[PDB]
Structures are given as C-alpha cells and as structure tokens.
C-alpha cells in the first residue's frame, strides 16, 4: 500500500518481452484499483520514471534508464568488459555475453549478437536458470558450499533437451568446471545451441561469467581459447581500474 511498494510493482509489470502497456493493464497486473493505478502511473509519468509514447501507451522512461545506469556497478563492469567482448564477437560471430548471480538465478549484464546468429534466450537485464546455463554452472562452481547446496536442493526444471536436473550429476559437472576453467552445455537451454562459459576474477574471487552461445554443431575448443584470452584481458583491466 506504500507509494514505493506500488511504484516497484508497476515497474515489475514491464519485462524483457513487454515494453508497452495501457495504464489499465498496469493496474490489473500490479493488482492496483483502476483509480489508484492511473494516479500512480500519472505521477511516475510526470517525474519521467515512465513515458507515454505517440501511440498513448506507457513505457519504462528514458529518465529511469539514465538514473538507474549512470555510474552503476552494472555499467562500470560492462565498460571494463565490453572492449574484450567485442574482440571475442569479431572472431566467433555468434553471441558473447556477461552474467552474474542474482538471488540464485543468472542475470545478464551484456549481450553482443551477430546478425544471423543461432537462437539465444539470454537477454540483457533478463535471467536464465543457474543449473541449466553454462553461465550459471560456471558461477555456481565458484559459489560457496551453502549456495551450491541451496540451488541444488530446489526443483530443477528441464529447460532444453540436454538439461541435467540430477543433483549428483550437477555436483560432478561443477567439479569438472572448477578444474577445467570452462564449462560447455550442449543443448541445456535450446536444442540448437551450446553455451560456453569461463570465469572472470577480481581480487582472487569469481565475480562474473563470460560466455559464448553458438550452434551446438560448432567446434567448442576454438571458442574456449577465445573466451579464456578475453577473460585474461578483462582481469588485467579490472586490476588497472
């Protein structure tokens, strides 16, 4: 019922696949009374958190984008990583992405895509499951015993045809990934794709996963070597900043 709580619920009705809503539809999805929903949306429009387009629909505001991103930890990490990720992207010509753990899910901070690339379900400011993605497996492999036990104790849905949902197999995959310095996950998210992930370290701690998404049929090792090179470059720049 507090204004802040209602404002967060309005923001939560938007998503990766939902850019434009009527203020009525916002009220329904946010469980606000119609009268209240228009008042909250109108106030949020006036301060620029939301915008009305020329089509009259409500969208996340440029002003919100600006205030949320400027000087943010997400932007600072993205700026250090991006030059190296572009060099990966030049060579592999599929997808290059950067992910962190956020409340036991994968959150993507960056995604570069080539024009006719394989399908890719990772979205900037979107999520995928920890157990099912190369990014998640690499991050979970470097998380604490507590976090490993916590994620592996929850119901693990099948995402793609290759998803491993057995806790015992997952522990062994995490062990392999820990030793190898990479994990490939053929078809764990989609039938068409392999995700390949390496760790990004800062002050001896894994803070992110750098990955490629490429066709499942493509060679893994050449992409592993490109990702490892890029990772060293990012770790060098993190040290220097």
Q: How far is the CB of 143 from a second copy (least distance, A)?
A: 13
Nearer to a second copy, 109 or 137 (CB): 109
3 interacts with a second copy by CB under 8 A: yes
Q: Name which position in 91, 123, 201, 228 contacts a second copy (CB under 8 A).
A: 123
Q: Name which position in 29, 114, 171, 201 contacts a second copy (CB under 8 A).
A: 114
Which residues in the 148-207 window bind a second copy by CB under 8 A?
A: 205
Kindly report the number of other CB atoms within 10 A of residue 169's CB atom: 10
63 interacts with a second copy by CB under 8 A: yes
Kindly report the number of other CB atoms within 10 A of residue 79's CB atom: 12
Which residues in the 5-24 window bind a second copy by CB under 8 A?
A: 5, 7-8, 11-12, 14-19
Residue numbers of the site for a second copy (CB under 8 A)?
2-5, 7-8, 11-12, 14-19, 43-44, 47-49, 51, 54, 59-60, 62-76, 79, 82-83, 86, 89, 100, 102-103, 107, 111-115, 123-126, 205
């Amino acid at each position: 019922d507090s204004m802040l709580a209602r404002v967060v619920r309005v923001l939560e009705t938007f998503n990766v696949d939902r850019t434009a809503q009527t203020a009525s539809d916002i009220g329904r999805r946010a469980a606000l009374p119609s009268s209240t929903a228009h008042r909250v949306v109108d106030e949020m429009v006036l301060v620029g958190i939301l915008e009305r387009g020329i089509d009259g629909k409500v969208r996340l505001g440029m002003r919100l984008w600006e205030l949320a991103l400027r000087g943010s930890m997400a932007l600072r990490l993205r700026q250090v990583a991006l030059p190296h990720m572009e060099r990966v992207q030049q060579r592999v010509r599929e997808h290059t992405q950067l992910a962190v753990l956020e409340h036991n899910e994968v959150l993507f901070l960056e995604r570069l895509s080539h024009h006719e690339a394989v399908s890719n379900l990772a979205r900037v400011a979107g999520r995928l499951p920890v157990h099912a993605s190369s990014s998640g497996l690499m991050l979970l492999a470097h998380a604490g015993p507590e976090v490993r036990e916590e994620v592996l104790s929850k119901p693990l849905p099948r995402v793609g045809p290759g998803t491993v949902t057995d806790p015992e197999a997952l522990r062994r995959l995490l062990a392999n990934a820990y030793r190898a310095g990479y994990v490939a996950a053929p078809g764990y998210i989609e039938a068409v794709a392999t995700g390949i992930a390496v760790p990004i370290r800062s002050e001896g701690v894994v803070i992110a996963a750098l990955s490629a998404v490429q066709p499942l049929q493509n060679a893994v090792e050449p992409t592993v070597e490109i990702l490892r090179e890029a990772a060293v470059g990012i770790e060098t720049d993190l040290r220097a900043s």
